[PDB]
Every structure is written in C-alpha cells, then in structure tokens.
Amino acid sequence: QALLRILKETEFKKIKVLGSGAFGTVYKGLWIPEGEKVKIPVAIKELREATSPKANKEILDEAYVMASVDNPHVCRLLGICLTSTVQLIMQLMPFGCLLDYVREHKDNIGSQYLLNWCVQIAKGMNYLEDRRLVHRDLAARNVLVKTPQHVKITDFGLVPIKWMALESILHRIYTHQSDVWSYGVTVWELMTFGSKPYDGIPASEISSILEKGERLPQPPICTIDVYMIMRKCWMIDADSRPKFRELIIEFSKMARDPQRYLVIQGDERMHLPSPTDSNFYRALMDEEDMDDVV
Numbered sequence: 001q002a003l004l005r006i007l008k009e010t011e012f013k014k015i016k017v018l019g020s021g022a023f024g025t026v027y028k029g030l031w032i033p034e035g036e037k038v039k040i041p042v043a044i045k046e047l048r049e050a051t052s053p054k055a056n057k058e059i060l061d062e063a064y065v066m067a068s069v070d071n072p073h074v075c076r077l078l079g080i081c082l083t084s085t086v087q088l089i090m091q092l093m094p095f096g097c098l099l100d101y102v103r104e105h106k107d108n109i110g111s112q113y114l115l116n117w118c119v120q121i122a123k124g125m126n127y128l129e130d131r132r133l134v135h136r137d138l139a140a141r142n143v144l145v146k147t148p149q150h151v152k153i154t155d156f157g158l159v160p161i162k163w164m165a166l167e168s169i170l171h172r173i174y175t176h177q178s179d180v181w182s183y184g185v186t187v188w189e190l191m192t193f194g195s196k197p198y199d200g201i202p203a204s205e206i207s208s209i210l211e212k213g214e215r216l217p218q219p220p221i222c223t224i225d226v227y228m229i230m231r232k233c234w235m236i237d238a239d240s241r242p243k244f245r246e247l248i249i250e251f252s253k254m255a256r257d258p259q260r261y262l263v264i265q266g267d268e269r270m271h272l273p274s275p276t277d278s279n280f281y282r283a284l285m286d287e288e289d290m291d292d293v294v
C-alpha cells in the first residue's frame, strides 16, 4: 500500500487536456509538493463520473495493483485523489503515445526504431503475463513514448473490436493469448505508420471477416517474415498464437539486423542514437535501469 500515494486536491492542478481515454479524461498537470516551491509536470486522469465511498474500495483495490508493477516497459500508477470524481496520477510522457508519434514521423522513423519498439512492447506484455495481469486493451494508443528509444505500456487491467481476438469478440474471453492478438494489430499499426485497422468496415461485421479467414494486409515496408508473425498472432486457435517470450526473441533476432526484415526508403540515412546521444537522453529524461536497445 506504500506504492500508491494518497493525494490532496490542493497539491496538484490540471492545466491542459491531453486527450480522452478509459473511464475519464487525461490532463497534463502540475504537482506542487506541500511546503515547496517547485512545480512537477504530471499526468492526471479525472473520471467521467461521480463515485461513492463504496465504489472507491473497488477503485483502490485495483489502484494498488496498478501501482505495484515494476518493469521498464510498463507504466506504473503513482497516486490517487479520492475527490468525488476520482483523479489518478502517473508520470507524464512528453513524447506522447506511440500511435501519434508514428503518424507524425511517418515514413521517416527507420527500421531499427520500429523493431526495437516491438521488442519493448513484448517485454512489457511478457511482464504483465508473468504478473498474471491481462491487458485487455493493448493498442498503439496505449503505448507511451518516454524517449524515442524507450516505450512503456499503459492502461492495462481495466469497445476496441478491431484490436480484439475473435474469442474476445464472440465470448468476451480475455487471456494473455488474446493480448497476443492485440499485439499483432499494434505491430500492424506501427508498420503502417498509424493506419486505422479495418478502416471503413462496420464493427458488427468484423467477426464475420475473421471467421471467413481474412486478416489485415501486409504493410509495404514489411518483409514476409514480419507479416507472418502478425498473422500467427491472429490464428483462431488461441494456443497456436506465439507467446510474448517468443515474440521478444524473434523481434530481437530481427533487430540484430533490421534492414533485412523492414524495407524502408532512406533507412540508412536514419539510424538509432549514437552512445553519446543515448547517454544525453538518459541523463536528462530516462534515468531508469532499462536493459538496452538492440
């Protein structure tokens, strides 16, 4: 219970709306420690509804779990303010979500970032599986960018039909193997630089298209090796889909040599940060003990 700090309304302020997500609106905010003069940027989620003391017990019970995750690629809940409409606090990611990031640097990211992102998302998901926590809403929008070299998964354990496995659409079954399905769509989002999956198709017909056997198409920058992993994530039998621990190894193998698995125009004119630049980013923005990029 020492991982979730109970906050007062007077020690933080919302200053700008960042967007809208699960159970409420997310703001960029400022934390002002009691008796201090500093202003610390934070992220604040204010629920879209009023709550009662009783429901706040269900909230705090889940909030203690959400604050107990410890992995470089999983976001941790930091605090909560039980003010009628509950307010949650986590670290603010200045680079935004990976979905917006990949759209904004479209066709200009490079293969080595993309593959390492897949490695890091799989590391976080494999961590959640080790904790026996199902995400249930993995998507590019829920992958935050701490630095361009370091992403973290957020908002797990809380309808996105076009990301859900077939057994989740048909029977609301959410397992770690259905998280693998959503991971496949998330990678598809990254390889298409943020395209909307099954765009233009009504949600009510998605289950039919999956039962008929059709899947999202192969991105032009993807070799067949990459598309196959995506397709193996979308097999109808959940236990036939790959494990997150296997996805880590496979995308790490492809990251040890990126240009053979992604075909991008100008890829050599990009490249990952030099160690000099990597140490600069980390001393300013990312002091965590993350492993390393491939």
Ligand SMILES: CN1CCC(c2ccc(-c3ccc4c(c3)C(=O)N([C@H](c3cccc(F)c3)c3nc5ccccc5[nH]3)C4)cc2)CC1
Binding pocket: 022, 023, 026, 027, 043, 044, 045, 055, 056, 058, 059, 060, 062, 063, 066, 074, 075, 076, 077, 078, 088, 089, 090, 154, 155, 156, 158
């Ligand atoms: C009858 N009634 C039905 C529903 C009700 C209820 C309502 C809310 C939560 C609940 C309880 C706890 C969390 C969330 C949501 C929720 O959305 N969370 C995100 C999360 C999850 C995991 C890791 C992580 F870093 C963050 C998250 N996004 C943020 C954005 C900005 C600031 C803070 C943020 N916090 C944590 C549980 C039950 C109680 C019973």
Ligand SMILES: *CCC(=O)Nc1cc(Nc2nccc(-c3cn(C)c4ccccc34)n2)c(OC)cc1N(C)CCN(C)C
Binding pocket: 018, 019, 020, 021, 022, 026, 028, 043, 090, 091, 092, 093, 094, 095, 096, 097, 098, 099, 100, 101, 141, 142, 144, 154, 155
């Ligand atoms: C994908 C939408 C998005 O996340 N946009 C931005 C997020 C920023 N930081 C941040 N830090 C912590 C938590 C969140 C967060 C969590 N959830 C569930 C959200 C839902 C909707 C919106 C944000 C959410 N976000 C951020 O830092 C300043 C900026 C952005 N924006 C607006 C775009 C990114 N880029 C232009 C800077």
